[PDB]
Design a protein around this ligand. Structure first.
Ligand SMILES: Nc1nc(Cl)c2nc[nH]c2n1
Ligand SMILES: Nc1nc(Cl)c2nc[nH]c2n1
Lengths: 270, 283, 280
């Protein structure tokens, strides 16, 4: 892995800047239709970016709702074995590219008993189990260029962005699907046992997933404002103690794409 | 360091198959109480890990672990005598490999015992707590044994851990205990893994108890996860080798020797229990 | 460099060639203890840079030998926090070196977030127990081959925070008129270096944790493992925010400042504890 220090991040950023003229203000990490809505877009496969982590995923530049965006199509999940530096690099690259707001979605298990399949849970906070347990993405020498040794995670999930997202949902008639909640990261890749889910629920967790927190931590560390939503893709089984016709349509994607586009449209500009 | 991929697992499996004709249906990982199990194995071949190329090496004080093939209650078994505990510093691949080797050897059921601290206040020293579920603290915390490239040959990227502790096997174990007059010693419970090797502080025990944990140990889950991942059915029991101290203001301290002593004392019972379970496993 | 008997001996032997002081008490300066080293008399200051095979922190930390309240001490000025990326062996080595040097009692301070709602900024929370989240999660400092020379494979953490030393510390606080600042509590280690989210703090609090920090437990574990008695205190350098809706937050400069304000008190406290430690 190449260290996510100022020097390497600059190199990758500079390379990307030679491929696109688009200075992204908003970065989006796709937990997939979004990219499709992007206009006047350049698609840069990771494979074409020297020193960029490989998953091939694409970096997509263009405009969305009249805003310059960089979209990550292909994430680096820790359960895959990616290093802290590999996961951190793209976010820090976004920082150097001009990204001020990071919007991310993920799939999560609904722990909260009031959640419904396909609900949206806006992250208003998280519990970073790996981070509490000495697998925090920031462990290692602090990269001072990007942020402080001991980042505070207060307002990690920008309250204004959260308010905005909620309003946009409300206005476009799907406020009923939208919740705010605490996301706990399970390092994965095992789904959580019922005992784990029960514990996580009782810990005050609403949704559980294997992603996002590390990117959020890096983003916050370098001052990028964060908006994150979990799609409740399954209801966690809490009880350790018959198949039907199932529709698994990418309609949450369309809704979520629309939601993101409409949020981006209303983001304050400069 | 040898990756627990299809290629290496096959190599080890193939080597073992050149040493024994026994195709094991049941794999048994001897924890505590099970030291004796191996002894009951009939028509057995004992294959020290040292004699298996690319097989992980363990030792009990310099004495290499053994893979023991033979029959038990008329069933072909492979018995692991010598486990790889993560607190020893073994890698994910080192711990996973033997289970995947068992898979290739024909193992369909994994039976494992371990020593555990009794968190549940209703547990008694030497009670048997059948795992009906677990809390994989290392797993939640980014030290899951499956972290890394998924080995597709063995199982899926995101294994579900529903019915990880096969409910039918649990039911069977309980019946066998009941029938042989020690149902009173047998509980089902949630096992939480402490990575270890420190025993849990009273504050840790209190927390774990309040998290809904019944017993705590430093083993087993990683093997269970690998087993489940490759579709091996799992039966696991904790011997309550000590009652967890929940109160920091207290003399009573966990110690490995007492732990070994409870295993030693219950080993015969547990051996018998396992043998009688194996006897009634569907074939 | 593995913290085995051989390497620890080498480092210890080197140090013993630099100082005649056989330390009975080792002190790890956290927060409130920058000053401690200053009170040390007849002291030799050995920068880590001058100790072959000794871990390097910073500039450069010092090993300080001398007497404090008439007792021979070794003071660590410069710790190895796991969030910096130090290995188990790097963190364990100095403690094991202390063991070989003659250390019988380890006194350590740290900065911590006050989870317990009854805590005040600048309170002292004596550790009476801990929750070693990294340890529960397979990042225990002892993971790896056990170094038998130093201790057992499965150390018990009963009375990890020596009750007698805790009693003493409380008495000393009481006698010197700051018992009101002194609490005993459960310390939970967050691996860090992020401060805890409000959701994390809430969880930790409900887990029965009183203070949260990113240090100490690994040293305590190594100390206990090799039979060194442990006394540990957290300075409450910030009150944990439990509510995400709250502009209010941890500020590291305020942590440092709060720590520093109490250093004199904490130095005095430690000196007065050391003074009353039973001797041989
Ligand atoms: N983690 C752990 N804790 C306790 Cl109390 C034990 N007693 C026997 N094995 C054990 N493993
Ligand atoms: N992990 C952690 N949390 C809080 Cl509130 C702290 N305050 C001082 N050091 C600290 N370390």
């Amino acid at each position: 892995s190449v260290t996510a220090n100022i020097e390497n991040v600059k190199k990758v950023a500079h390379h990307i800047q030679k491929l696109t003229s688009i200075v992204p203000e908003i970065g989006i990490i796709c937990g997939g239709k979004l990219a499709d809505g992007v206009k006047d877009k350049i698609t840069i496969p990771y494979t074409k970016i020297p020193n960029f982590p490989q998953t091939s995923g694409n970096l997509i530049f263009g405009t969305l709702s009249g805003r310059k965006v960089v979209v990550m199509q292909g994430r680096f999940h820790m359960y895959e074995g990616y290093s802290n530096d590999t996961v951190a690099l793209p976010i820090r690259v976004m920082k150097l590219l001009g990204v001020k707001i990071l919007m991310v979605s993920n799939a999560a298990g609904g722990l909260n008993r009031s959640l419904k399949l396909g609900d949206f849970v806006i992250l208003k906070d998280h519990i970073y189990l790996p981070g509490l347990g000495l697998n925090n993405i920031l462990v290692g020498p602090n990269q001072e260029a990007f942020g402080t040794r001991f980042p505070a995670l207060s307002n990690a999930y920008d309250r204004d962005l959260r308010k905005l997202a909620v309003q946009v949902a409300e206005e476009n008639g799907f406020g009923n699907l939208v919740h705010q909640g605490v996301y706990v990261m399970n390092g994965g890749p095992c789904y959580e046992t019922p005992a784990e889910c029960t514990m996580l629920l009782n810990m005050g967790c609403d949704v559980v997933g294997m992603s996002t927190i590390p990117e959020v931590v890096i983003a916050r560390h370098c001052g990028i404002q964060v908006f994150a939503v979990s799609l409740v893709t399954n209801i966690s089984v809490l009880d350790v103690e018959h198949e039907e016709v199932l529709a698994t349509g990418a309609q949450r994607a369309e809704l979520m794409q629309s939601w993101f586009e409409k949020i981006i449209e209303k983001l304050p500009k400069d």
